[PDB]
Amino acid sequence: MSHQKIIQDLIAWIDEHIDQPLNIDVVAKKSGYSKWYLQRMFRTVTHQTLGDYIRQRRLLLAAVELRTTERPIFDIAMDLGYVSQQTFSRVFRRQFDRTPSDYRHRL
Amino acid sequence: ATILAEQLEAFVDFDPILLRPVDDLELVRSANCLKAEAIHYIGDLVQRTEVELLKTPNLGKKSLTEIKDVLASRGLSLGMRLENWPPASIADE
Amino acid sequence: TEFLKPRLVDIEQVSSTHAKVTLEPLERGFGHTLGNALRRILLSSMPGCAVTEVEIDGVLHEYSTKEGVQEDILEILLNLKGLAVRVQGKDEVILTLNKSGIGPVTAADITHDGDVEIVKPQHVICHLTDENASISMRIKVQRGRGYVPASTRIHSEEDERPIGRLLVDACYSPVERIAYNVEAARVEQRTDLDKLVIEMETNGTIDPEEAIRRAATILAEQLEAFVDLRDPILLRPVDDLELTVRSANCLKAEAIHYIGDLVQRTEVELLKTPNLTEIKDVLASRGLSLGMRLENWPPA
Amino acid sequence: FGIDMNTDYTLEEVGKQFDVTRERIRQIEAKALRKLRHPSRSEVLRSFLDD
């Protein structure tokens, strides 16, 4: 099996258990690889970060789960990768130049 | 007929999607990672043991929710002998 | 309601053949209920012990003759139907009988057993007449109900007995003949009350008290319908495959009998023999593979 | 064997039209057996053998 098939399955791996408390080290058990072999191969194809990749969409899916539902932000930290809200809001201001609170108020 | 008897009490004192590979069973993390051990179908999936098929570098400790729940509705076992599995058709995606 | 339930009362045992049982209380019409409905049950379904298989040495069949005996041999089998013997525990006892010199072999000529109770030992079985007459029979006694003739046992058992085993039909039914009457029972405030005498006359072997205790046992269980209710491939041998002459020279050199014994081995367990693509061609067609482990084998 | 037609043949009489081999045509028959003896397919003809 060539390597361009695996990252097609690696992105067919991730988007189904984002509401789960998921990490990179369980991907390496499911893909059988080591913990380090995931992060070299993503740069030949995407030229982005795969360590922050599973952390990017826990903003992007909390950009619709907070947006559609009436969920408050202090349960997003304990499940979607963090421990407190003071770090979750900072990753948003580097990505899309916004704060989480005034992200919904903009119709 | 009770009353006659009460007088006597002092006197007696195959499935269609089971012919179908893992990409078409309304599921997607039970499809792409089985064909890379030369089992492209449910066929040798039921004979082979989930201590080694999950130990290969495509499955693992979360695939048993997507094999044993399949083996709940389809009844097949760990190591089972298949009656008539392969037709002439063999293909992939 | 004003129902009234009966009691067993009297055992006026007149003989060892002739008896009488009274019964009370009974209401109007229920004398003809329980006077009649026992009688049809009583005349058929009583289990008794009766002679079945009388066998004598030196007599080949029932149409032979033996000397020193005054009687013809079929007639002696007809004598041996009238035997009342009270056996208690088991269902098969093989009595034995001997005698010598002049004198009638009667029913008092058996070597007795413990649970065997002959009722009528005075019954005549034979009449030996010569001085060197010495009869000897090996009788099977059974225990049953209903009627069995000789020919019923014949077709039902295909197993072949030795010669000389002269059968007799199975007259099991140890009741002979009953009658009953309906008279009035003297209870004061209910002057309509009626009593019932059931005279029972039969042979031995039966206490007439237990004859009706089992008779209601027959009837009261047939009301319980009313008081309640309103791989072939695996056993296929080696030669069916039309297989190649080189590999059948090898699978018979690797000592495997069935295809289940072959898949009991794996593909690795065939490569050491001289003179895999063929089995990978043919096993994938008719629904087989290799590498499949069998347990609880063989099933014969 | 005279099946399906009339004239019973000899082993040479097959060779006049087909092939003039002698002991391969004698060995035709020997594995004509070993492909058709098979007493589980021929069990139907074994119900003819107990005639």
Coordinates of C-alpha atoms in Angstrom, one line a residue:
Chain A
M1 CA 0.0 0.0 0.0
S2 CA 1.3 3.4 -1.0
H3 CA 1.3 6.3 1.4
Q4 CA -1.2 8.6 -0.4
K5 CA -4.0 6.0 0.5
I6 CA -3.3 6.2 4.2
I7 CA -3.9 10.0 4.6
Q8 CA -7.1 9.5 2.7
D9 CA -8.1 7.0 5.4
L10 CA -6.5 9.2 8.1
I11 CA -9.0 12.0 7.1
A12 CA -11.7 9.3 6.8
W13 CA -10.6 8.4 10.4
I14 CA -11.1 11.7 12.3
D15 CA -14.3 13.5 11.5
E16 CA -16.6 10.9 13.2
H17 CA -15.6 11.0 16.9
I18 CA -14.9 14.7 17.4
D19 CA -17.4 14.9 20.3
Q20 CA -15.3 12.1 21.9
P21 CA -12.3 13.0 24.1
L22 CA -9.9 11.9 21.3
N23 CA -6.1 12.3 21.0
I24 CA -3.3 11.5 18.5
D25 CA -2.0 8.5 20.5
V26 CA -5.2 6.4 19.9
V27 CA -4.9 7.1 16.2
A28 CA -1.4 5.6 16.2
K29 CA -2.8 2.5 17.9
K30 CA -5.5 2.2 15.3
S31 CA -3.2 3.0 12.4
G32 CA -0.5 0.8 14.0
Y33 CA 2.2 3.4 13.5
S34 CA 4.3 5.2 16.1
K35 CA 3.3 8.5 17.7
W36 CA 5.9 10.3 15.6
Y37 CA 5.2 8.9 12.1
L38 CA 1.9 10.8 11.7
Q39 CA 3.4 14.2 11.9
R40 CA 6.1 13.9 9.2
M41 CA 3.8 12.6 6.4
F42 CA 1.2 15.4 6.6
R43 CA 3.7 18.0 5.3
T44 CA 4.3 16.3 1.9
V45 CA 0.6 16.5 1.1
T46 CA -1.1 19.3 3.1
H47 CA 1.9 21.4 4.3
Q48 CA 0.0 22.1 7.6
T49 CA 0.0 20.8 11.1
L50 CA -1.5 17.4 12.0
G51 CA -0.9 17.9 15.8
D52 CA -3.2 21.0 15.8
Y53 CA -5.5 19.4 13.1
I54 CA -7.5 17.4 15.6
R55 CA -7.5 20.6 17.7
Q56 CA -8.6 23.0 14.9
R57 CA -12.0 21.4 14.3
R58 CA -12.9 21.4 18.1
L59 CA -13.1 25.1 17.5
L60 CA -14.8 24.7 14.1
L61 CA -17.4 22.3 15.4
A62 CA -17.8 24.4 18.5
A63 CA -18.3 27.2 16.0
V64 CA -21.6 25.5 15.1
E65 CA -22.4 23.5 18.3
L66 CA -22.3 26.7 20.3
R67 CA -23.8 28.6 17.4
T68 CA -26.9 26.4 16.9
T69 CA -27.6 25.1 20.5
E70 CA -27.9 26.9 23.8
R71 CA -24.7 25.3 25.2
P72 CA -22.4 27.4 27.5
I73 CA -18.7 27.5 26.9
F74 CA -17.5 26.0 30.1
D75 CA -18.2 22.4 29.1
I76 CA -16.4 22.8 25.8
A77 CA -13.0 23.0 27.6
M78 CA -13.3 19.7 29.5
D79 CA -14.2 17.6 26.5
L80 CA -12.9 19.3 23.4
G81 CA -9.2 19.3 24.3
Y82 CA -8.5 21.7 27.2
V83 CA -8.9 22.3 30.9
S84 CA -10.2 25.9 31.2
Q85 CA -11.8 28.6 29.0
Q86 CA -8.7 30.9 29.1
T87 CA -6.9 28.9 26.5
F88 CA -9.8 28.0 24.2
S89 CA -10.6 31.6 23.3
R90 CA -7.0 32.4 22.5
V91 CA -6.7 29.8 19.6
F92 CA -9.7 31.5 18.0
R93 CA -8.0 34.9 17.9
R94 CA -5.1 33.4 16.0
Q95 CA -7.2 31.5 13.5
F96 CA -10.2 33.7 12.5
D97 CA -9.4 37.1 14.3
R98 CA -12.4 36.8 16.6
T99 CA -13.5 36.3 20.3
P100 CA -16.0 33.4 20.9
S101 CA -18.7 35.7 22.5
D102 CA -19.1 38.1 19.6
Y103 CA -18.9 35.3 17.1
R104 CA -22.6 34.4 17.5
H105 CA -23.9 38.0 17.8
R106 CA -22.8 38.7 14.2
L107 CA -25.8 37.6 12.2
Chain B
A1 CA -66.1 -30.7 33.8
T2 CA -64.7 -29.2 37.0
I3 CA -67.7 -30.5 38.9
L4 CA -67.3 -34.1 37.7
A5 CA -63.7 -33.8 38.7
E6 CA -64.4 -32.2 42.1
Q7 CA -66.6 -35.3 42.8
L8 CA -63.4 -37.3 42.4
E9 CA -60.9 -35.5 44.7
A10 CA -61.7 -37.9 47.5
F11 CA -61.0 -40.7 45.0
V12 CA -57.7 -39.6 43.5
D13 CA -56.5 -39.0 47.0
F14 CA -28.8 -15.1 4.1
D15 CA -28.7 -11.3 3.9
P16 CA -28.3 -8.9 0.9
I17 CA -25.8 -6.5 2.3
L18 CA -24.0 -9.6 3.7
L19 CA -23.0 -10.2 0.1
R20 CA -21.5 -6.7 0.0
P21 CA -18.2 -5.2 1.0
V22 CA -17.6 -2.8 3.9
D23 CA -18.1 0.4 1.9
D24 CA -21.8 -0.1 1.4
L25 CA -23.4 -1.1 4.8
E26 CA -24.7 2.3 6.1
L27 CA -21.7 3.0 8.5
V28 CA -17.3 5.0 7.8
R29 CA -14.7 3.6 10.2
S30 CA -15.4 0.0 9.4
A31 CA -14.6 0.2 5.6
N32 CA -11.2 1.5 4.6
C33 CA -9.0 -0.5 7.0
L34 CA -10.0 -4.1 6.4
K35 CA -8.9 -4.6 2.8
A36 CA -5.2 -4.0 3.6
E37 CA -4.8 -7.5 5.1
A38 CA -6.1 -9.3 2.0
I39 CA -9.6 -9.6 3.4
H40 CA -11.7 -7.4 1.1
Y41 CA -15.0 -8.6 2.5
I42 CA -16.8 -10.1 5.5
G43 CA -15.4 -13.5 4.5
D44 CA -12.1 -14.1 6.3
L45 CA -13.2 -11.4 8.7
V46 CA -15.3 -14.0 10.7
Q47 CA -12.7 -16.8 10.7
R48 CA -9.7 -14.6 11.7
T49 CA -9.3 -13.6 15.3
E50 CA -9.8 -10.0 16.5
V51 CA -6.6 -10.4 18.7
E52 CA -4.5 -10.3 15.5
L53 CA -6.8 -8.7 12.9
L54 CA -7.1 -5.8 15.3
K55 CA -3.3 -6.1 16.0
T56 CA -2.5 -5.4 12.4
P57 CA -1.6 -1.7 11.6
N58 CA -5.1 -0.9 10.3
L59 CA -7.5 -1.9 13.1
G60 CA -7.4 -1.9 16.9
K61 CA -9.3 -1.8 20.2
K62 CA -12.2 0.3 18.8
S63 CA -13.0 -2.0 15.8
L64 CA -14.7 -4.6 18.0
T65 CA -17.7 -2.3 18.3
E66 CA -17.9 -2.5 14.5
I67 CA -17.3 -6.3 14.2
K68 CA -19.1 -7.9 17.2
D69 CA -22.2 -5.8 16.6
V70 CA -22.1 -7.0 13.0
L71 CA -21.7 -10.6 14.4
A72 CA -24.8 -9.9 16.6
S73 CA -27.2 -9.5 13.8
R74 CA -25.5 -11.9 11.3
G75 CA -24.8 -14.6 13.9
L76 CA -21.4 -15.7 12.6
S77 CA -18.7 -16.7 15.1
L78 CA -15.0 -16.5 15.8
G79 CA -13.4 -19.1 13.5
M80 CA -16.5 -20.2 11.7
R81 CA -16.7 -22.4 8.6
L82 CA -18.4 -20.8 5.7
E83 CA -20.9 -22.7 3.5
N84 CA -20.6 -20.9 0.2
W85 CA -18.7 -17.5 0.4
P86 CA -16.9 -16.6 -2.9
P87 CA -18.6 -16.1 -6.2
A88 CA -16.7 -15.6 -9.5
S89 CA -16.8 -11.8 -9.0
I90 CA -13.8 -10.2 -7.3
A91 CA -13.4 -6.4 -7.4
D92 CA -12.4 -3.3 -5.4
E93 CA -12.9 0.5 -5.4
Chain C
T1 CA -74.5 -24.0 46.2
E2 CA -75.4 -27.2 48.2
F3 CA -72.9 -29.8 46.8
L4 CA -71.8 -32.8 48.7
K5 CA -68.5 -34.7 48.2
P6 CA -68.3 -38.4 48.5
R7 CA -66.1 -40.6 50.8
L8 CA -64.8 -44.1 50.4
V9 CA -66.5 -46.0 53.2
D10 CA -66.7 -49.8 53.0
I11 CA -64.6 -52.7 51.9
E12 CA -66.9 -55.8 52.4
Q13 CA -64.4 -58.3 51.0
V14 CA -66.5 -61.4 50.5
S15 CA -63.8 -63.7 49.0
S16 CA -60.4 -63.5 47.2
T17 CA -62.5 -63.5 44.0
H18 CA -65.7 -61.8 45.0
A19 CA -66.0 -58.3 46.6
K20 CA -68.3 -55.4 47.3
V21 CA -67.6 -51.6 47.8
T22 CA -70.2 -49.2 49.0
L23 CA -70.0 -45.5 48.3
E24 CA -71.6 -42.3 49.7
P25 CA -72.8 -39.5 49.6
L26 CA -74.1 -39.2 46.1
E27 CA -76.7 -36.7 44.8
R28 CA -79.5 -37.3 42.3
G29 CA -78.3 -38.6 39.0
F30 CA -74.7 -38.6 40.1
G31 CA -75.2 -42.3 41.1
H32 CA -75.6 -42.9 37.4
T33 CA -72.6 -40.7 36.8
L34 CA -70.1 -42.5 39.0
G35 CA -71.8 -45.9 38.8
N36 CA -71.3 -46.0 35.1
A37 CA -68.1 -44.0 34.3
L38 CA -65.9 -46.2 36.5
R39 CA -67.2 -49.4 34.9
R40 CA -66.1 -48.7 31.4
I41 CA -62.7 -47.5 32.7
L42 CA -62.5 -50.4 35.2
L43 CA -63.0 -53.1 32.6
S44 CA -60.1 -52.2 30.4
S45 CA -57.2 -50.3 31.9
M46 CA -56.2 -52.1 35.0
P47 CA -52.5 -53.1 35.0
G48 CA -51.8 -56.7 35.9
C49 CA -49.1 -59.4 35.8
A50 CA -49.8 -62.2 33.3
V51 CA -48.0 -65.0 31.6
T52 CA -46.4 -64.3 28.2
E53 CA -43.6 -66.7 27.1
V54 CA -43.7 -70.4 28.2
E55 CA -40.7 -72.3 26.8
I56 CA -39.9 -76.0 27.3
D57 CA -36.7 -77.9 26.5
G58 CA -36.9 -80.7 24.0
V59 CA -40.1 -79.3 22.4
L60 CA -39.5 -77.5 19.2
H61 CA -42.9 -75.9 18.6
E62 CA -46.5 -75.6 19.8
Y63 CA -47.5 -78.4 17.5
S64 CA -45.1 -80.9 18.9
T65 CA -45.8 -83.7 21.4
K66 CA -43.9 -84.7 24.5
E67 CA -44.2 -88.1 26.2
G68 CA -45.2 -88.7 29.8
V69 CA -47.5 -85.7 29.4
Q70 CA -51.2 -86.5 29.1
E71 CA -52.0 -83.3 27.3
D72 CA -51.3 -81.7 23.9
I73 CA -48.9 -78.9 24.0
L74 CA -51.0 -76.0 22.7
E75 CA -53.7 -77.0 25.2
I76 CA -51.1 -76.6 28.0
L77 CA -50.4 -73.1 26.7
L78 CA -54.2 -72.6 26.9
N79 CA -54.0 -73.8 30.5
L80 CA -51.3 -71.2 31.2
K81 CA -53.4 -68.2 30.5
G82 CA -55.4 -68.7 33.8
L83 CA -52.5 -67.7 36.1
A84 CA -53.1 -65.1 38.9
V85 CA -49.7 -64.1 40.2
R86 CA -49.1 -60.9 42.3
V87 CA -45.8 -59.4 41.5
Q88 CA -44.9 -56.1 43.2
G89 CA -41.8 -54.2 42.1
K90 CA -40.3 -55.1 38.7
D91 CA -42.0 -55.9 35.3
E92 CA -40.2 -59.1 34.2
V93 CA -39.7 -62.3 36.2
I94 CA -38.6 -65.7 34.8
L95 CA -40.2 -68.5 36.9
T96 CA -39.0 -72.2 36.7
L97 CA -40.9 -75.4 37.2
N98 CA -40.0 -79.0 37.8
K99 CA -41.6 -82.3 38.7
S100 CA -41.0 -86.0 38.2
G101 CA -42.9 -89.3 38.2
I102 CA -46.7 -89.7 38.0
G103 CA -48.7 -86.8 39.2
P104 CA -50.3 -83.6 37.8
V105 CA -48.0 -80.6 37.5
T106 CA -50.2 -78.0 39.2
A107 CA -49.5 -74.3 40.0
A108 CA -47.8 -75.2 43.3
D109 CA -44.7 -76.4 41.4
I110 CA -42.7 -73.2 41.0
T111 CA -39.5 -72.2 42.7
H112 CA -40.8 -69.0 44.2
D113 CA -39.3 -65.5 44.4
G114 CA -39.7 -62.8 47.0
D115 CA -42.0 -60.3 45.3
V116 CA -43.8 -63.1 43.5
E117 CA -47.1 -64.0 45.1
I118 CA -49.0 -66.8 43.3
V119 CA -52.6 -66.2 44.1
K120 CA -54.0 -69.6 43.0
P121 CA -51.4 -72.4 43.5
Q122 CA -54.0 -75.1 43.3
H123 CA -54.6 -74.6 39.6
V124 CA -53.8 -77.5 37.3
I125 CA -51.2 -76.8 34.6
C126 CA -50.6 -80.4 33.4
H127 CA -51.0 -84.1 34.1
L128 CA -47.8 -86.1 34.0
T129 CA -48.6 -89.8 33.7
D130 CA -45.3 -91.7 33.2
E131 CA -42.7 -92.6 35.8
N132 CA -39.9 -90.9 33.8
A133 CA -42.0 -87.9 33.0
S134 CA -40.1 -84.8 34.1
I135 CA -41.3 -81.5 32.6
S136 CA -39.3 -78.3 32.8
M137 CA -40.5 -74.9 31.5
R138 CA -38.9 -71.4 31.5
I139 CA -41.8 -69.0 31.7
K140 CA -41.5 -65.3 31.2
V141 CA -44.0 -63.3 33.4
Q142 CA -44.6 -59.7 32.5
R143 CA -46.7 -56.8 33.8
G144 CA -49.1 -54.9 31.6
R145 CA -52.5 -53.5 30.7
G146 CA -54.7 -54.0 27.7
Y147 CA -54.6 -56.8 25.2
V148 CA -51.7 -58.0 23.1
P149 CA -51.9 -61.0 20.8
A150 CA -49.0 -63.1 19.6
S151 CA -48.8 -61.5 16.1
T152 CA -48.5 -57.9 17.6
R153 CA -45.2 -58.7 19.2
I154 CA -43.9 -60.3 15.9
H155 CA -44.0 -57.3 13.5
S156 CA -43.1 -54.7 16.3
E157 CA -39.8 -56.4 17.0
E158 CA -37.6 -57.4 14.1
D159 CA -35.1 -59.0 16.5
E160 CA -35.0 -62.7 16.1
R161 CA -35.5 -64.9 19.1
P162 CA -34.1 -68.4 19.5
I163 CA -36.2 -71.3 18.4
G164 CA -38.5 -73.0 21.0
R165 CA -39.8 -69.7 22.5
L166 CA -43.5 -70.5 22.3
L167 CA -45.6 -67.4 22.8
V168 CA -49.0 -67.0 24.5
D169 CA -51.3 -63.9 23.9
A170 CA -51.4 -61.3 26.7
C171 CA -54.6 -61.4 28.6
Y172 CA -53.6 -58.7 31.1
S173 CA -57.0 -57.4 32.3
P174 CA -57.4 -58.6 35.9
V175 CA -61.0 -57.6 36.3
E176 CA -63.6 -60.2 35.4
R177 CA -67.1 -58.7 35.8
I178 CA -68.8 -56.0 37.9
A179 CA -72.3 -54.7 38.6
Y180 CA -73.7 -52.0 40.7
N181 CA -77.0 -50.5 42.1
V182 CA -78.5 -47.2 43.2
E183 CA -80.2 -47.1 46.6
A184 CA -80.9 -44.3 49.0
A185 CA -78.4 -43.0 51.6
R186 CA -79.9 -42.1 55.0
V187 CA -78.8 -38.6 55.8
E188 CA -81.5 -36.8 57.8
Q189 CA -82.0 -33.3 56.5
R190 CA -81.3 -34.3 52.8
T191 CA -83.7 -37.3 52.3
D192 CA -83.0 -37.5 48.5
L193 CA -79.5 -38.7 49.2
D194 CA -78.4 -41.9 47.5
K195 CA -75.8 -44.5 48.1
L196 CA -74.0 -46.8 45.6
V197 CA -72.7 -50.3 46.0
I198 CA -70.2 -51.5 43.4
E199 CA -69.8 -55.2 43.6
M200 CA -66.6 -56.3 42.0
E201 CA -65.9 -59.9 41.1
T202 CA -62.6 -60.8 39.5
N203 CA -59.6 -63.1 39.9
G204 CA -56.8 -62.5 42.4
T205 CA -53.8 -60.2 42.2
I206 CA -55.9 -57.0 42.9
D207 CA -57.0 -55.5 46.1
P208 CA -60.4 -54.0 45.1
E209 CA -59.8 -50.9 47.2
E210 CA -57.0 -49.7 44.9
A211 CA -58.9 -50.6 41.8
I212 CA -61.0 -47.5 42.0
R213 CA -58.2 -45.2 43.4
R214 CA -56.4 -45.8 40.1
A215 CA -59.7 -45.6 38.2
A216 CA -60.3 -42.1 39.2
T217 CA -56.6 -41.4 38.5
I218 CA -57.4 -42.4 34.9
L219 CA -60.4 -40.2 34.6
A220 CA -59.3 -37.1 36.5
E221 CA -56.3 -36.5 34.2
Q222 CA -58.3 -36.5 31.0
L223 CA -60.3 -33.6 32.4
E224 CA -57.1 -31.6 32.5
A225 CA -57.7 -31.0 28.8
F226 CA -61.0 -29.5 29.9
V227 CA -60.6 -27.9 33.3
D228 CA -57.7 -26.1 31.7
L229 CA -58.0 -26.0 28.0
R230 CA -61.5 -24.5 27.5
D231 CA -22.8 -29.1 6.0
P232 CA -22.5 -31.7 3.3
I233 CA -19.2 -30.4 2.0
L234 CA -17.5 -31.2 5.3
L235 CA -18.2 -34.9 5.2
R236 CA -17.2 -35.2 1.5
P237 CA -14.3 -37.6 0.8
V238 CA -11.1 -37.2 -1.2
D239 CA -12.0 -38.6 -4.7
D240 CA -14.8 -36.2 -5.6
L241 CA -12.5 -33.4 -6.9
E242 CA -11.2 -35.2 -10.0
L243 CA -7.9 -34.0 -8.6
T244 CA -4.5 -34.1 -10.3
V245 CA -2.6 -37.4 -10.4
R246 CA 0.5 -35.7 -8.9
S247 CA -1.2 -34.2 -5.9
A248 CA -3.5 -37.3 -5.2
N249 CA -0.2 -39.1 -5.2
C250 CA 0.7 -36.7 -2.3
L251 CA -2.5 -36.3 -0.3
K252 CA -2.6 -40.1 0.0
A253 CA 1.0 -39.8 1.0
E254 CA 0.0 -37.3 3.7
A255 CA -2.6 -39.6 5.2
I256 CA -5.8 -37.5 5.3
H257 CA -9.2 -39.2 5.1
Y258 CA -11.9 -36.5 4.9
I259 CA -11.8 -32.9 3.7
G260 CA -12.5 -31.9 7.4
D261 CA -9.2 -33.7 8.2
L262 CA -7.5 -31.7 5.5
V263 CA -8.7 -28.3 6.7
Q264 CA -7.8 -29.7 10.2
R265 CA -4.3 -29.1 8.8
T266 CA -3.2 -25.8 7.2
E267 CA -1.5 -25.0 3.8
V268 CA 1.9 -25.1 5.5
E269 CA 1.3 -28.8 6.5
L270 CA 1.3 -29.9 2.8
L271 CA 4.5 -28.4 1.3
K272 CA 7.0 -31.0 2.4
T273 CA 6.1 -33.6 -0.3
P274 CA 7.6 -34.0 -3.7
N275 CA 6.4 -34.8 -7.3
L276 CA -0.8 -24.4 -3.9
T277 CA -2.2 -22.6 -6.9
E278 CA -4.5 -25.6 -7.7
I279 CA -6.2 -25.6 -4.3
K280 CA -6.3 -21.8 -4.3
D281 CA -8.2 -22.2 -7.6
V282 CA -10.7 -24.8 -6.6
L283 CA -11.4 -24.0 -2.9
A284 CA -12.5 -20.5 -3.9
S285 CA -15.3 -21.8 -6.2
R286 CA -17.5 -24.2 -4.2
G287 CA -17.3 -22.3 -0.9
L288 CA -14.1 -23.2 0.9
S289 CA -10.8 -21.8 1.9
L290 CA -7.8 -22.9 3.9
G291 CA -6.6 -22.2 7.5
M292 CA -9.9 -23.0 9.3
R293 CA -9.8 -24.6 12.7
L294 CA -12.3 -27.4 13.7
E295 CA -13.3 -28.3 17.2
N296 CA -15.4 -31.1 18.6
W297 CA -14.2 -33.3 15.7
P298 CA -15.0 -36.0 14.7
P299 CA -18.8 -36.3 15.0
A300 CA -18.6 -39.9 13.6
Chain D
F1 CA -19.7 -51.1 -26.0
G2 CA -22.4 -50.8 -28.7
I3 CA -24.3 -47.9 -27.0
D4 CA -26.3 -45.4 -29.0
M5 CA -25.7 -47.2 -32.4
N6 CA -25.5 -50.8 -33.7
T7 CA -22.1 -52.2 -34.7
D8 CA -20.1 -53.5 -31.7
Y9 CA -16.5 -52.5 -32.1
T10 CA -12.9 -53.6 -31.5
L11 CA -10.1 -51.4 -30.2
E12 CA -8.6 -51.4 -33.7
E13 CA -12.0 -50.5 -35.2
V14 CA -11.9 -47.2 -33.3
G15 CA -8.5 -46.6 -34.7
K16 CA -9.6 -46.8 -38.3
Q17 CA -11.4 -43.4 -38.1
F18 CA -10.0 -41.8 -35.0
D19 CA -6.5 -42.8 -33.9
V20 CA -4.5 -46.0 -34.4
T21 CA -3.1 -46.1 -30.9
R22 CA -3.3 -49.4 -29.1
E23 CA -2.5 -49.2 -25.4
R24 CA -3.3 -45.6 -24.8
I25 CA -6.7 -46.5 -26.3
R26 CA -6.6 -49.4 -23.9
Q27 CA -5.6 -46.9 -21.1
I28 CA -8.4 -44.6 -22.2
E29 CA -10.8 -47.2 -20.6
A30 CA -8.7 -47.6 -17.4
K31 CA -9.0 -43.9 -16.5
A32 CA -12.5 -43.8 -18.0
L33 CA -13.1 -46.0 -15.0
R34 CA -11.1 -43.9 -12.5
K35 CA -13.0 -40.8 -13.5
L36 CA -16.4 -42.6 -13.5
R37 CA -16.1 -45.3 -10.8
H38 CA -17.0 -42.9 -8.0
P39 CA -19.6 -44.8 -6.0
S40 CA -21.2 -41.7 -4.5
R41 CA -22.0 -40.2 -7.9
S42 CA -22.6 -43.8 -9.3
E43 CA -24.7 -44.8 -6.2
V44 CA -27.7 -44.3 -8.5
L45 CA -26.1 -47.0 -10.7
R46 CA -25.3 -49.0 -7.6
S47 CA -29.1 -49.2 -7.1
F48 CA -28.7 -51.0 -10.5
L49 CA -25.8 -53.1 -9.3
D50 CA -28.0 -54.9 -6.6
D51 CA -30.3 -56.2 -9.4

